[PDB]
Amino acid sequence: GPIPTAPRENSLMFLSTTPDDTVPAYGNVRTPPVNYLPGEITDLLQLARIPTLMAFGRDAYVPYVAVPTQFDDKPLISFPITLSDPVYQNTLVGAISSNFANYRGCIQITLTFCGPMMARGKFLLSYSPPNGTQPQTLSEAMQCTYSIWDIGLNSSWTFVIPYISPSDYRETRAITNSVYSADGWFSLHKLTKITLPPDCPQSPCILFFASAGEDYTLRLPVDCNPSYVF
C-alpha cells in the first residue's frame, strides 16, 4: 500500500543553497561539445595565485611607487596587510576573497623595479605583525621579518608575507580582524642610497603585484557587494 511518511517541519520550503537537485523539465538534450576550449577554470584559486597590480593613492590611483632620491629613515611605502584595504580592491586576491568570508594563506607581493638598467642598490622588505603603532623607522623595520632585495640579478622579488594569526582563518572584510589594529604592515624600505647613473632618469618606479601563495585557501561564500554596477 502507501508508504506512511511523516513530513518534517520544513516542508514546502524553498531554501536557496539546498545541496540537492530538482525535477528535470526538458531532459534528453545533447549539448554541443566543449572539448575545443582551452583553459578550463576548475577552481577560482587558479586566479588568486596570478599576480595582479595593486593600487596606491599618491579615482586615478597608481600601481607603482615613485622612488625619491632623498635618503630617509621612514618607509618608502607602507600599506597594511588587510584584504579589505583599498590597496587590494582591484587585485585578484582582494577581489575574489572579498566575496568570501574567511581566508588562510600567504599573500605574495611580487615586486618589479622599473628603473634603468645600471641602477645599483638594496631594498629592505619588512613585514610586521599587528602592533599598536605602525613601524616607521628602519631600525623598527630590521627587528621584524625582513628580506634584503638588491638591484642585482633580482629586478623582481616575491616577498611571501607570512600567515601569523590567532585563528585558523581570518575575517576577510574587516578593518580590525584581530587585536587592536590593522593586521600587519608590509613596508618597502630603501637600505643603501640608490646609485642612479647620470643621463638615466632619476626617481625610478617600483611596480607592485599581489598574488596568493600555494597554500592560500578560502571559505564560506557570501553575497557579494553589488556596488560595482552603479
Binding site: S128, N131, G132, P162, Y163, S167, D215
Partner: protein, 246 residues
Amino acid sequence: VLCAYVEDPTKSDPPSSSTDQPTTTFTAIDRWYTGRLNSWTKAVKTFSFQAVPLPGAFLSRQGGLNGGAFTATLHRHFLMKCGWQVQVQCNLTQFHQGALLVAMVPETTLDVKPDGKAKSLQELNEEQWVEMSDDYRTGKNMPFQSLGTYYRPPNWTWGPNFINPYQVTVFPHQILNARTSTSVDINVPYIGETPTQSSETQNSWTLLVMVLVPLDYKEGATTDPEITFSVRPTSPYFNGLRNRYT
C-alpha cells in the same frame, strides 16, 4: 604537583595559526619568577580572594613580579602560547588555622574594577583582598559596553565571567591547609579559543588565592603569614616577531 587535564603539560605542539618558525625559547627558561602577594590576616573575611592574572602579572608587575627576559620576550612577539606553572608558598605554622584555596582559574576578569577599566598597583594595595560581594558572584563587574546615548542603558544583572565561590574547587587547585601542607604546586597547560592568543591582551589563566576558612591565631603567637608565588611558563611558542610594544 597538580598537573592539569593531561599527564604532561610540558608537551605542546607549535601553533597551527602561523607560517613562521616559533621562537620556542629565550635566554633563561629554567628559572622561576617570584613576586610578593598581600599578607593574610584575621580581618580577611571568608571568600575574599586575590587574583594574579597570567600573563597580566609579568607586565603590570603585581607584587614585584619581575619578568626578566620573559616580559622582554613577550613584548617582542605578537602571538604567545605557553602553559603555566605556579607555586604559592605561605608559612603556615602550627599556631595558625585556616585554609587558602590556590587555583588556576581559566578565563576570568577578576583584576577588573567592578566599576571601570583595569586595576592599578596602588589600588591593589589599598584594599589588599577583594571581597566576594554580589557583583563577583553574579559577574556584574566585568566591564559594561559603552552603548552610547542612543540606546537606553539596560540594567546589567549578570555576566558570564562570575565566580561561584562555592565551586572554585573544580579548577586545578590545592588547598593550602594549616596542617597538611605549607605550599601548593599547580602545573597547567595552554588553553585558548585560538591555537595561540595575543601577548599583550590575553588572560587564559589566573592564579587565584581564596580564603576558605578565616585565619585565626592566638595573640603573641606567630602572626600574619606572608604569601609568595612563583610563576614559570612551560614550553612557550612565541609567534610574530616584531619590535617592542608601544
